[PDB]
Amino acid sequence: YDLPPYGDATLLYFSDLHGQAFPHYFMEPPNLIAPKPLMGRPGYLTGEAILRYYGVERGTPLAYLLSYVDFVELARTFGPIGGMGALTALIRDQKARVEAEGGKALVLDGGDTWTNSGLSLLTRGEAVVRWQNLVGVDHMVSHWEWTLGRERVEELLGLFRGEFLSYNIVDDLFGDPLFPAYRIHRVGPYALAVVGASYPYVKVSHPESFTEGLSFALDERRLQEAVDKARAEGANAVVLLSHNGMQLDAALAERIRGIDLILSGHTHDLTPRPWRVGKTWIVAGSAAGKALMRVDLKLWKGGIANLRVRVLPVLAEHLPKAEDVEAFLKAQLAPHQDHLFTPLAVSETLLYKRDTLYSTWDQLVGEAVKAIYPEVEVVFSPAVRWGTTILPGQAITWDHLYAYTGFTYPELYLFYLRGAQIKAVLEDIASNVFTSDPFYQQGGDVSRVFGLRYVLDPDAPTGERVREVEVGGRPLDPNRRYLAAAYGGRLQRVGEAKPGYEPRPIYEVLAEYLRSVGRVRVRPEPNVKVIGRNYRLPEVTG
């Protein structure tokens, strides 16, 4: 944390906090499978390879943040990551140092901040905004924020003291932008523009009602125009605070002229060294409060001459307390502490969420659903990248359940699907996740389907990526009707609702199951064989 001065301006960047108020554990994915053309790129590095790529020594605090390798042991060594208190303390420490050097600091939030946590659900996002205000966030962009609905977002923007930016959120009839595209900040004799981009796929990714009247479409012309306008106004350097997803950002760096640095959210990536694409540097925003990225820039009349990037681990056991934040969280959650923090069950093994294809947490959810609804044959779990990690011997609480399943639309649906639909769903998802054109990458993973097994060839043509599907030990029958369960998506829209079943929040089902069993012990049993790749698993004990 004790860095020497560098450059003219400092960006203190974090993204995809997902309302995570408290220190917790968050392991990186064991697999980030890519079609051959995208292999070895930032955003597709895991395990030992990511450590080698960045020259990070095994067993270090950065290694703990960066890879699943040695996870449990390193979690027991360095402690939990994140927490709004610790993140605040770190941001304040860095901002103070910068200002004492005569430098200039900006606090930039990449979005996916307001939602998906106990604190968020209990306050419809308000407490998270109040926290941003305590820290002093200068700008933010968005994605999951919209799951609170337009009206609530508008209310919260009234409360937010920073300036929300987005070049791409426009009225869906007239096309007039609804927010400022960028803000220019003076940096000594220089000027630095921060341009914002919100996720372009909000409409198809969440309930339609949440964004009625709005368009978020990626618009290269409008983005180029914003960049050009900022420079015409005198901006020497341009930074894009983005929620596009890092691969789409990389594609944009080869298409848009004049973007010097992109701060990439959405994909929850980590980039200890910036990724050079075209004439642009790219730095990812990580997630769940794991890290604060410090980017020091040396500017020149026409852009960024050089930069220093440092991933600062947010390790609560190694940072001072932000007393005002601690007090605020206590006041906000005191009335809900018994609910949020009482143990529901103990997990005997590592429960993780992130992976291209499979996770122990998602398997637990599949087992819970099947235990309560034995008629269900396949359980489709949403492959979101937000969540948390439960260590062996650790108690699972309601706060964890909200971290894993805290959608504002948490309903579990039971419906019938024909066999052909099951296969088609996986193939369609595979076509998106494994497209080789980063311009079309959406930044998501593959739905986890408990109750079935399949073979995946990421490099096969569309229509041939998913094969040898089996349900309950038998080959998939295309004309057979199977009872499916799903939450966090739209799959139920193409099925036949189970008569007599009333959809209810997935977290209620999970709490019922966990209270009943008392202890869980999910062993990693991946249900997918991947052609052309070694499918990796972390060590789940220790």
Least distance (Å) between residue 70 CB and Mn ion: 25
Return the amino acid letter for 446.
V
Q: Name the minimum Å distance from CB 403 to Mn ion.
A: 12
Q: Is 112 annotated as a binding residue?
A: yes
Residue that the structure tokens 């430098």 belong to: 103
- Is residue 2 marked as binding? no
- Give least dist CB 368 to Mn ion, A: 24
| Count of helices and strands (H, E) across the chain | 16, 27
Residue whose beta carbon is closest to Mn ion: 112
Q: Which residue shows structure tokens 């593959």?
A: 446
Q: DSSP states of 344-396 as a string?
A: SEEESS-B----SS--HHHHHHHHHHHHH-TT--EEEE---S---BBPTTEEE
Question: Which residues form the interface with Mn ion (CB under 5 A)?
Answer: 16, 112, 143, 266
Q: Rounded to 5 degrees, what are φ and ψ at 154? A: -60, -45
Q: Find out whether 266 is annotated in a ligand binding site.
A: yes
Q: In this complex, which beta carbon is closest to Mn ion, that of residue 112 or of residue 296?
A: 112
CB proximity list for 142: less than 8 A, separation 6 or greater: 111, 112, 153, 164, 166, 169, 198, 199, 243
Residue (354 or 465) nearer to Mn ion, CB: 354
Shortest reach from residue 405's CB to Mn ion, in Å:
15
Nearest distance from C-beta of residue 265 to Mn ion, angstroms: 6
* Pick 25 or 199: Cβ nearer Mn ion: 199
CB 410, min distance to Mn ion, A? 17
d(CA 124, CA 354): 25
- Is residue 469 within 8 Å of 456, Cβ to Cβ? no
Rounded Cα gap, residues 346 and 393, in angstroms: 6
Cβ of residue 68: shortest distance to Mn ion, in angstroms? 19
The Cα-based distances of 441 to 207, 214, 289, 437 in angstroms read 21, 22, 24, 7
| Of 92 and 143, CB closest to Mn ion | 143
> Which of 31, 147 has the CB closer to Mn ion?
147
Taking the least distance from each CB to Mn ion, the nearer of 16 and 109 is 16
- Cβ at position 231, least distance to Mn ion in Å: 28
Residue 369, C-beta contacts closer than 8 angstroms, at least 6 positions apart: 376, 379, 412, 450, 485, 509
- The answer to whether 62 and 292 are in contact (CB under 8 A) is no
The Cβ of residue 337 has, within 10 Å, a number of other Cβ atoms equal to 11
Residue with Cβ nearer Mn ion (51 or 121): 121
Per the CB < 8 A criterion, the answer to whether 107 and 136 are in contact is yes
CB of 457 to Mn ion, least distance (A): 28
The answer to whether 16 is a known ligand-binding residue is yes
Residues 6+ away with beta carbon under 8 Å from 542:
72, 73, 76, 392
The tokens describing 322, both together, are 């932000």
**CA–CA gap between residue 132 and residue 109 (Å, rounded):** 9
Q: Which is nearer to Mn ion, 142 or 349 (CB)?
A: 142
Is 25 in contact with 72 (CB distance < 8 Å)? no
143 is in an annotated binding site: yes
Of the pair 427, 445, the CB lying nearest Mn ion is at 445
List Cβ neighbours of 233 (8 Å cut-off, separation of 6 or more).
184, 191, 193
Q: Is 435 helix (H, G, I), strand (E, B) or coil?
A: coil
Q: Is 18 annotated as a binding residue?
A: yes
How many alpha carbons lie under 13 Å from residue 265 in its C-beta half-sphere?
Answer: 31
The candidate with the shortest Cα–Cα distance to 537, out of 95, 31, 3, 198, is 31
Q: Between 288 and 456, name the residue whose CB sits nearer to Mn ion.
A: 288
**Shortest Å distance, C-beta 164 to Mn ion:** 16
List residues forming the annotated binding site: 16, 18, 112, 143, 243, 266, 268
List residues forming the annotated binding site for Mn(2+): 16, 18, 112, 143, 243, 266, 268
